[PDB]
Structures are given as structure tokens and as C-alpha cells.
């Protein structure tokens, strides 16, 4: 189906001594493929998926140079923002940035994004037109004027619509064996008595990819939300994801209840019953 490339950057100031902690991660869809950590020994961009390892020295030298440049920009920004907000040199603050591109099934450009946060709140973001800026407050408005004058959106648009998509396509090809494979959820139901006349039914979806999934309960063919619990989708640790949904039912009435599983890896949704 559709695909995306996304980079996430976090810089955290360390007022007591030294420079900010800087961490960058890159993803294709729900697969991490590179990382940089200022605390790590290599001081280089590092591979985190087999299909990126085939890239040669010029690639790794270039990604390292760029990620260090990103880190210096964020380091300077921490000082600038402290000033904008009249904050003390005493406290730790955070800059976050995320950017990337989406393509459709035809691998053509669909959407781009580039957004920036200070202390966990929206600061400035490129609009979907890739021309305009959303500034959350008056400090961000100062940045917006600066970025208008420096043609920033033009450069960002060029990267998002061109370079970003070109390299996404390259990665999708090189990592096709996994990146273009869907792993359907392996599903089962468990039963846990909560008294001698009521029980929890838990509907499990395991080892699936991508992370997107929907789990729903029905009773007698109609949606059931009362007495249900749905946990947030969580990583298994091997590149796949997990989720469960549960419902409390009167014992003996289990057959009324059906769990419904929707996932891109399933041609048709699955229905599970206790039995």
C-alpha cells in the first residue's frame, strides 16, 4: 500500500555540565533503519536494519555529517528559545523535530511534513501546502518571520517532494523482502474467570506488521463497548506489534461475543469466538 519515511530528533539541554543529549532515529513505515545517539561511542549514524547496511562509505559519511549538523542547529536553538521565553540557564529544556514524506501505492509523492516543538508543545510547523507556517505563539511567530525571509519552506518543499521520495523508493526496493511484506496478526482468545459466574474474554493479536490494527467486540452481532478494555498497540521487540481487547461476560454466555480483527495483512477481517 502506501509508504512513509520519517525522521525524529530530540535534543535535551544539560544545564549542569556539557552539551545537550541528541538522539535521531529514522523510520521507513514502522521499521527503524538508522539511529544517532550523542552519548554513544561511534559518533556516527548507525544502521538498525539489514537492508541499509549495504549502503557504502559515502552514504554513512554523509548521513553522519548531516545528523551532526542537525544536532548543532538544535543546540543553538535551545539557547535562542531560552532567550525568547526569558528562561533561566538553570533548567533543562527540549527541542523536538520530525519530518518526512508519504507516497501512495504508485510510490508517487502524497504528503510532506516538517514540524518542531519546544518543551513538548507545538512550536512551528510547515503546513500541508509546503509553503506556509503554523506558529503556535509569539516566539514561534518570530521564527516564522525569520524562516519566511530565508526561503526555508522552499528548501523544505524541494526535499520533501524530491529527495525524500527518491530515497524512500530506494529503501523500499532494497528492503523489499520485509518492507513490502505484511505480517497478518496471529489471533487467539483466552478466558479468565473473575468470579464463579463471570469471566473475562481476551482477544489477542500478535506478531503483526504494520502496527495499524483494529480490534472490536460485538455481542449478538452488534458493537459492544461497555465492560471492555483495549490496550495500546505495543512492540513485541522483534519488529512486530501486539494488541489485545477484553470484555467481561456472564459465564455461560460466551458464544454471544465475537472479536473482530482488521489489519492490512488480512484479505478479509477475522472473527473469533471463545467456544
Amino acid at each position: 500500500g502506501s509508504h512513509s519515511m520519517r525522521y525524529f530528533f530530540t535534543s535535551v539541554s544539560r544545564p549542569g555540565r556539557g552539551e545537550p543529549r541528541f538522539i535521531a532515529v529514522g523510520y521507513v513505515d514502522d521499521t527503524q533503519f538508522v539511529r544517532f545517539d550523542s552519548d554513544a561511542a561511534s559518533q556516527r549514524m548507525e544502521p538498525r536494519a539489514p537492508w541499509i547496511e549495504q549502503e557504502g562509505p559515502e552514504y554513512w559519511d554523509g548521513e553522519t555529517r548531516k545528523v551532526k549538523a542537525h544536532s548543532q542547529t538544535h543546540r543553538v536553538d535551545l539557547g535562542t528559545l531560552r532567550g525568547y521565553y526569558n528562561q533561566s540557564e538553570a533548567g533543562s529544556h527540549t527541542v523536538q523535530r520530525m519530518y518526512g514524506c508519504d507516497v501512495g501505492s504508485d510510490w508517487r509523492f502524497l504528503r510532506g511534513y516538517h514540524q518542531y516543538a519546544y518543551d513538548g508543545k507545538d512550536y512551528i510547523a510547515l503546513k500541508e501546502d509546503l509553503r506556509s507556517w503554523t506558529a503556535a505563539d509569539m516566539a514561534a511567530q518570530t521564527t516564522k518571520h525569520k524562516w519566511e525571509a530565508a526561503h526555508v519552506a522552499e528548501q523544505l518543499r524541494a526535499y520533501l517532494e524530491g529527495t525524500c521520495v527518491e530515497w524512500l523508493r530506494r529503501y523500499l526496493e532494497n528492503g523489499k523482502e520485509t518492507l513490502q511484506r505484511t505480517d497478518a496478526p496471529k489471533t487467539h482468545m483466552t478466558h479468565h474467570a473473575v468470579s464463579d459466574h463471570e469471566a473475562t474474554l481476551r482477544c489477542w493479536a500478535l506478531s503483526f506488521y504494520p502496527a495499524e490494527i483494529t480490534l472490536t467486540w460485538q455481542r449478538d452481532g452488534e458493537d459492544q463497548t461497555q465492560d471492555t478494555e483495549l490496550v495500546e498497540t505495543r512492540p513485541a521487540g522483534d519488529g512486530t506489534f501486539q494488541k489485545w481487547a477484553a470484555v467481561v461476560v456472564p459465564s455461560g454466555q460466551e458464544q454471544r461475543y465475537t472479536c473482530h480483527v482488521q489489519h492490512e495483512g488480512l484479505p478479509k477481517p477475522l472473527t473469533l469466538r471463545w467456544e
Binding site: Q32, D37, D238
Partner: protein, 98 residues
């Protein structure tokens, strides 16, 4: 300003006596500095690794902490989390049914 959500779970459905992976997934927190330990019978497990820091659309952070473990009848496993938003460490016990 935003407290960590915690899930503790195994990578595979547990069978006593079969090696597995113990996960503690912390999410929805800010700022990013956080203390996460995995516990066996109340004691900290030494060789615990974690994922590279990333974040969601609302800018809140998430991390996975993990280590190899073997479920048994007698051993108790847990995740212990401390964060600026928490007045004291929060402990969530592993339950193989969740």
C-alpha cells in the same frame, strides 16, 4: 508534565520453563529523562537494554526496555518506573495473561 503509561509483558505467550523476553513499554511521557528497571523477585535485573528514544504526534516519548527471562511458577517479574511527574516509583507486576 505528562506521566508515563506502562505495559509489562512477554514477547511470546509464556510457558513456564521456556526462555522468552520481558518487555516494559513506557509511553506518553514528557520530558524524556526516565528511570526504568526490570525486576526479578524485587531485585534489579542487570543487563537490560532499551530502544532508541522516539516520540508520537503529540510529542510525548516512548521507549521499550527489555531483557531475556524464563517464566516460572515461583519467580515474580515487574517493571519499576520513576519520572519527574511521579511522586514515587511506580511498580507494575508482570502478569502472563496481559
Amino acid at each position: 508534565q505528562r506521566t508515563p503509561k506502562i505495559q509489562v509483558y512477554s514477547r511470546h505467550p509464556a510457558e513456564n520453563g521456556k526462555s522468552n523476553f520481558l518487555n516494559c513499554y513506557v509511553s506518553g511521557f514528557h520530558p524524556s529523562d526516565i528511570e526504568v528497571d526490570l525486576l526479578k523477585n524485587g531485585e534489579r535485573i542487570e543487563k537490560v537494554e532499551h530502544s532508541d528514544l522516539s516520540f508520537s504526534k503529540d510529542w510525548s516519548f516512548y521507549l521499550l526496555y527489555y531483557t531475556e527471562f524464563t517464566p516460572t511458577e515461583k519467580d515474580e517479574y515487574a517493571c519499576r518506573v520513576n519520572h519527574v511527574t511521579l511522586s514515587q516509583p511506580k511498580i507494575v507486576k508482570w502478569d502472563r495473561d496481559m
